[PDB]
Amino acid sequence: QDLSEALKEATKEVHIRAENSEFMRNFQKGQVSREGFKLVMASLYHIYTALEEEIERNKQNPVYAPLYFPEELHRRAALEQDMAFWYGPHWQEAIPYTPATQHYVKRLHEVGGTHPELLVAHAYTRYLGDLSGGQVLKKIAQKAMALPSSGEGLAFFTFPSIDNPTKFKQLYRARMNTLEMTPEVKHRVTEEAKTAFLLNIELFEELQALLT
Ligand code: HEM
């Protein structure tokens, strides 16, 4: 079974629970406010920063290299623009760093530093989600908070180097299937992807609580 297929099959159930988490439900209903949005984007700032830092550390490692797409996918620079937009010039010392965010970041560094062969599970989970559900949330965000079509405040949800996200995802799935793969690695990779989803679910539950 191809890795791409193994991953989709392995995370399809937790994906359902993830997109139906309270925070995402309210978001999809359009009940998302500036406070909540700023909180989740700041958290994403930390997460992608850690993720992309580990990607750089392993860009030349064969167990990840085929998926090294900084120009097309990386979100840190975009998140930094969004942070300046929502938090101002000194967003650096203004943004929050929640426990659930720290937990996620912690795992990202363990993987990147000790289990680089599992890093693909974390890139897959975040990036392909960004190119799928994230695009739907983008429209909802714009309508709900009156964000300009010009993109300010939503740079994270914008991929200027990707013309067709659908075609890109196809490319990415096929590229995932070129990675050296053994039963041991395939099993663990799909397992780490489920973990990635859970870390996300826990972030949402934490953020939802903080808002209430
Ligand atoms: C906001 C609610 C969400 C919606 C509306 C949504 C919807 C979708 C849709 C329509 C697809 C299928 C696209 C395709 O086959 O190319 C998809 C794929 C995916 N989503 Fe979500 N999603 C949501 C939340 C999430 C979250 C929270 C994550 C994890 C951070 C996530 C990660 C993924 C991944 C990894 C894929 C690619 C699966 C694959 O083709 O292998 N999604 N999503």
CSV table of C-alpha atoms and ligand atoms in Angstrom, one decimal:
chain,number,residue,atom,x,y,z
A,1,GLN,CA,0.0,0.0,0.0
A,2,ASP,CA,1.4,3.4,-1.0
A,3,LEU,CA,2.3,5.7,1.9
A,4,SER,CA,-0.1,8.4,0.7
A,5,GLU,CA,-2.9,6.0,0.8
A,6,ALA,CA,-1.8,4.5,4.1
A,7,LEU,CA,-1.8,8.0,5.6
A,8,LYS,CA,-5.2,9.0,4.3
A,9,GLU,CA,-6.7,5.7,5.5
A,10,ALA,CA,-5.0,6.0,8.9
A,11,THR,CA,-6.1,9.5,9.7
A,12,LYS,CA,-9.5,9.6,8.1
A,13,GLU,CA,-11.3,8.9,11.3
A,14,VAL,CA,-9.4,11.3,13.5
A,15,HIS,CA,-9.8,13.8,10.7
A,16,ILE,CA,-13.5,13.6,11.2
A,17,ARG,CA,-13.2,14.2,14.9
A,18,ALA,CA,-10.7,17.1,14.2
A,19,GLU,CA,-12.9,19.0,11.8
A,20,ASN,CA,-15.8,18.6,14.2
A,21,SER,CA,-14.0,19.9,17.2
A,22,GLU,CA,-15.9,22.7,19.0
A,23,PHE,CA,-13.5,25.4,17.9
A,24,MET,CA,-13.8,24.3,14.2
A,25,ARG,CA,-17.6,24.0,14.5
A,26,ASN,CA,-18.0,27.6,15.6
A,27,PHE,CA,-15.4,28.7,13.1
A,28,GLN,CA,-17.2,27.0,10.3
A,29,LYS,CA,-20.5,28.5,11.5
A,30,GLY,CA,-18.7,31.9,11.3
A,31,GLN,CA,-18.9,32.6,15.0
A,32,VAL,CA,-15.1,33.2,15.1
A,33,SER,CA,-14.1,36.5,16.6
A,34,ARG,CA,-10.8,38.5,16.6
A,35,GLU,CA,-9.8,37.3,20.0
A,36,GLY,CA,-10.2,33.6,19.1
A,37,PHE,CA,-8.6,34.0,15.7
A,38,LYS,CA,-5.6,35.9,17.1
A,39,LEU,CA,-5.2,33.1,19.6
A,40,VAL,CA,-5.2,30.3,17.1
A,41,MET,CA,-2.9,32.1,14.5
A,42,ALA,CA,-0.4,32.9,17.2
A,43,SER,CA,-0.4,29.3,18.2
A,44,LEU,CA,0.1,28.3,14.6
A,45,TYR,CA,3.0,30.8,14.4
A,46,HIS,CA,4.8,28.8,17.1
A,47,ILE,CA,4.0,25.4,15.6
A,48,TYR,CA,5.0,26.1,12.0
A,49,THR,CA,8.1,27.9,13.3
A,50,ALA,CA,9.2,24.7,15.1
A,51,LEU,CA,8.1,22.5,12.2
A,52,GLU,CA,10.0,24.4,9.5
A,53,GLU,CA,13.0,24.8,11.8
A,54,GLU,CA,13.1,20.9,11.9
A,55,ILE,CA,12.5,20.7,8.2
A,56,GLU,CA,15.6,22.9,7.6
A,57,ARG,CA,17.6,20.8,9.9
A,58,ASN,CA,16.6,17.7,7.9
A,59,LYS,CA,16.3,19.1,4.4
A,60,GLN,CA,19.2,17.1,3.1
A,61,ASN,CA,18.1,13.9,4.9
A,62,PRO,CA,16.8,11.3,2.4
A,63,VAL,CA,14.0,10.4,4.7
A,64,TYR,CA,12.4,13.8,4.1
A,65,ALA,CA,14.2,15.6,1.3
A,66,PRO,CA,11.8,14.6,-1.5
A,67,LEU,CA,9.1,16.7,0.4
A,68,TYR,CA,11.3,19.8,0.9
A,69,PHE,CA,9.2,22.5,-0.6
A,70,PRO,CA,10.1,25.7,1.2
A,71,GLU,CA,9.0,28.1,-1.6
A,72,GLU,CA,5.6,26.5,-2.1
A,73,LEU,CA,4.6,25.5,1.4
A,74,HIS,CA,6.5,27.1,4.3
A,75,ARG,CA,4.2,29.4,6.4
A,76,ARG,CA,6.5,31.1,8.9
A,77,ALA,CA,7.1,34.3,6.9
A,78,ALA,CA,3.4,34.5,6.2
A,79,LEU,CA,2.6,34.0,9.9
A,80,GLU,CA,5.0,36.7,10.8
A,81,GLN,CA,3.1,39.1,8.5
A,82,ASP,CA,-0.2,38.0,10.1
A,83,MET,CA,1.2,38.4,13.6
A,84,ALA,CA,2.3,42.0,12.8
A,85,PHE,CA,-1.2,42.6,11.4
A,86,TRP,CA,-3.1,41.2,14.4
A,87,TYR,CA,-0.7,42.1,17.2
A,88,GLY,CA,1.1,45.2,15.8
A,89,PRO,CA,4.9,46.1,15.4
A,90,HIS,CA,5.8,44.4,18.7
A,91,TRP,CA,3.9,41.1,18.3
A,92,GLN,CA,7.1,39.3,19.3
A,93,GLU,CA,6.5,40.0,23.0
A,94,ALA,CA,2.8,40.2,22.7
A,95,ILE,CA,1.7,36.9,21.3
A,96,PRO,CA,0.7,34.0,23.6
A,97,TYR,CA,2.4,30.6,23.9
A,98,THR,CA,-0.1,28.2,25.3
A,99,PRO,CA,0.7,24.8,27.0
A,100,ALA,CA,-1.0,22.8,24.3
A,101,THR,CA,1.0,24.8,21.7
A,102,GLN,CA,4.2,24.1,23.7
A,103,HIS,CA,3.4,20.4,23.8
A,104,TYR,CA,2.9,20.3,20.1
A,105,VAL,CA,6.2,22.2,19.5
A,106,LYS,CA,7.9,19.8,22.0
A,107,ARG,CA,6.9,16.8,19.9
A,108,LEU,CA,8.0,18.5,16.7
A,109,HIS,CA,11.5,18.9,18.0
A,110,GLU,CA,11.7,15.4,19.3
A,111,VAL,CA,10.7,14.1,15.8
A,112,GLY,CA,13.0,16.5,14.0
A,113,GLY,CA,15.9,15.8,16.2
A,114,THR,CA,15.5,12.2,17.2
A,115,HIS,CA,13.0,10.6,14.7
A,116,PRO,CA,13.5,12.5,11.4
A,117,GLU,CA,12.0,9.6,9.5
A,118,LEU,CA,8.7,10.6,11.1
A,119,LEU,CA,8.9,14.3,10.1
A,120,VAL,CA,6.9,13.6,6.9
A,121,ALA,CA,3.9,12.7,9.1
A,122,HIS,CA,3.9,16.2,10.6
A,123,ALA,CA,4.4,18.1,7.3
A,124,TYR,CA,1.7,16.0,5.7
A,125,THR,CA,-0.8,16.7,8.5
A,126,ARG,CA,-0.3,20.5,8.5
A,127,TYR,CA,0.5,21.4,4.9
A,128,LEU,CA,-2.1,19.2,3.1
A,129,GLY,CA,-4.7,20.4,5.6
A,130,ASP,CA,-3.7,23.9,4.8
A,131,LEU,CA,-4.2,23.2,1.1
A,132,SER,CA,-7.6,21.6,1.8
A,133,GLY,CA,-9.7,22.6,4.9
A,134,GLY,CA,-7.6,25.7,5.5
A,135,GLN,CA,-8.8,27.1,2.1
A,136,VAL,CA,-12.4,26.7,3.2
A,137,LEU,CA,-11.7,28.4,6.5
A,138,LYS,CA,-10.1,31.2,4.7
A,139,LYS,CA,-13.3,32.2,2.9
A,140,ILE,CA,-15.2,31.8,6.2
A,141,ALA,CA,-12.7,34.0,8.0
A,142,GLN,CA,-12.9,36.8,5.3
A,143,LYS,CA,-16.7,36.9,5.5
A,144,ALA,CA,-16.9,36.7,9.3
A,145,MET,CA,-14.3,39.3,10.2
A,146,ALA,CA,-14.4,41.5,7.1
A,147,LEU,CA,-10.9,40.8,5.9
A,148,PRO,CA,-10.0,42.3,2.5
A,149,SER,CA,-9.6,40.2,-0.6
A,150,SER,CA,-6.2,41.7,-0.8
A,151,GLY,CA,-5.0,39.2,1.8
A,152,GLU,CA,-3.9,41.3,4.8
A,153,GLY,CA,-4.3,39.2,8.0
A,154,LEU,CA,-4.7,36.0,6.1
A,155,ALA,CA,-1.2,35.5,4.6
A,156,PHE,CA,-1.1,32.1,6.3
A,157,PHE,CA,-4.0,30.9,4.2
A,158,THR,CA,-2.4,32.2,1.0
A,159,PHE,CA,0.0,30.2,-1.2
A,160,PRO,CA,1.2,32.6,-3.9
A,161,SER,CA,3.7,30.0,-5.2
A,162,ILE,CA,1.1,27.4,-5.8
A,163,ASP,CA,-1.2,27.9,-8.8
A,164,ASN,CA,-3.3,24.8,-8.4
A,165,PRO,CA,-3.4,23.4,-4.8
A,166,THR,CA,-5.3,20.3,-6.1
A,167,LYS,CA,-2.5,19.5,-8.6
A,168,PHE,CA,0.1,20.3,-6.0
A,169,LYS,CA,-1.4,17.9,-3.4
A,170,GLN,CA,-1.3,15.2,-6.2
A,171,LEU,CA,2.4,16.0,-6.7
A,172,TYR,CA,3.0,15.9,-3.0
A,173,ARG,CA,1.2,12.5,-2.5
A,174,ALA,CA,3.2,11.0,-5.4
A,175,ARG,CA,6.4,12.4,-4.0
A,176,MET,CA,5.6,10.9,-0.6
A,177,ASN,CA,5.4,7.5,-2.3
A,178,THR,CA,9.0,7.8,-3.5
A,179,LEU,CA,10.4,7.9,0.1
A,180,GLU,CA,12.4,4.8,1.1
A,181,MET,CA,9.7,2.8,2.8
A,182,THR,CA,9.8,-0.3,4.9
A,183,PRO,CA,6.9,-1.8,7.0
A,184,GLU,CA,8.6,-0.4,10.1
A,185,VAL,CA,8.7,3.1,8.8
A,186,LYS,CA,5.3,3.1,7.2
A,187,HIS,CA,3.6,1.8,10.3
A,188,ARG,CA,5.3,4.4,12.5
A,189,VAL,CA,4.7,7.3,10.1
A,190,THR,CA,1.0,6.7,9.9
A,191,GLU,CA,1.0,6.4,13.7
A,192,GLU,CA,2.8,9.7,14.1
A,193,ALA,CA,0.2,11.4,11.8
A,194,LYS,CA,-2.6,10.3,14.1
A,195,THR,CA,-0.6,11.9,16.9
A,196,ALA,CA,-0.2,15.1,14.9
A,197,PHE,CA,-4.0,15.2,14.5
A,198,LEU,CA,-4.5,14.7,18.2
A,199,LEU,CA,-2.0,17.4,19.1
A,200,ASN,CA,-4.2,19.6,16.9
A,201,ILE,CA,-7.4,18.5,18.5
A,202,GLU,CA,-5.9,19.2,21.9
A,203,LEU,CA,-4.9,22.7,20.8
A,204,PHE,CA,-8.4,23.4,19.7
A,205,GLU,CA,-10.0,22.1,22.9
A,206,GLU,CA,-7.5,24.2,24.9
A,207,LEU,CA,-8.2,27.3,22.9
A,208,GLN,CA,-12.0,26.8,23.1
A,209,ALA,CA,-11.7,26.6,26.9
A,210,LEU,CA,-9.6,29.7,27.0
A,211,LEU,CA,-12.3,31.6,25.1
A,212,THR,CA,-15.0,30.4,27.5
B,1,HEM,C1,-11.6,23.2,9.3
B,1,HEM,C2,-12.3,21.8,9.1
B,1,HEM,C3,-11.7,21.1,7.9
B,1,HEM,C4,-12.2,20.9,6.6
B,1,HEM,C5,-13.4,21.6,6.0
B,1,HEM,C6,-11.4,19.9,6.0
B,1,HEM,C7,-11.7,19.4,4.7
B,1,HEM,C8,-10.9,18.6,4.0
B,1,HEM,C9,-11.1,18.1,2.6
B,1,HEM,C10,-12.3,18.5,1.8
B,1,HEM,C11,-10.1,17.3,2.3
B,1,HEM,C12,-9.9,16.4,1.1
B,1,HEM,C13,-9.1,17.0,-0.1
B,1,HEM,C14,-8.4,16.1,-1.0
B,1,HEM,O1,-8.7,14.9,-1.1
B,1,HEM,O2,-7.4,16.7,-1.7
B,1,HEM,C15,-9.2,17.3,3.4
B,1,HEM,C16,-7.9,16.7,3.5
B,1,HEM,C17,-7.0,16.8,4.5
B,1,HEM,N1,-7.1,17.4,5.7
B,1,HEM,FE1,-8.8,18.5,6.3
B,1,HEM,N2,-10.3,19.6,6.7
B,1,HEM,C18,-10.5,20.3,7.9
B,1,HEM,C19,-9.6,20.2,9.0
B,1,HEM,C20,-8.4,19.6,9.1
B,1,HEM,C21,-7.5,19.7,10.2
B,1,HEM,C22,-7.8,20.4,11.5
B,1,HEM,C23,-6.4,19.0,9.8
B,1,HEM,C24,-5.2,18.6,10.6
B,1,HEM,C25,-4.3,19.8,11.1
B,1,HEM,C26,-6.6,18.6,8.4
B,1,HEM,C27,-5.7,17.9,7.6
B,1,HEM,C28,-6.0,17.3,6.4
B,1,HEM,C29,-5.0,16.4,5.7
B,1,HEM,C30,-3.7,15.9,6.3
B,1,HEM,C31,-5.6,16.1,4.5
B,1,HEM,C32,-5.1,15.3,3.3
B,1,HEM,C33,-5.7,13.8,3.3
B,1,HEM,C34,-5.2,13.1,2.2
B,1,HEM,O3,-5.6,13.3,1.0
B,1,HEM,O4,-4.3,12.2,2.4
B,1,HEM,N3,-7.9,18.9,8.0
B,1,HEM,N4,-9.7,18.1,4.5
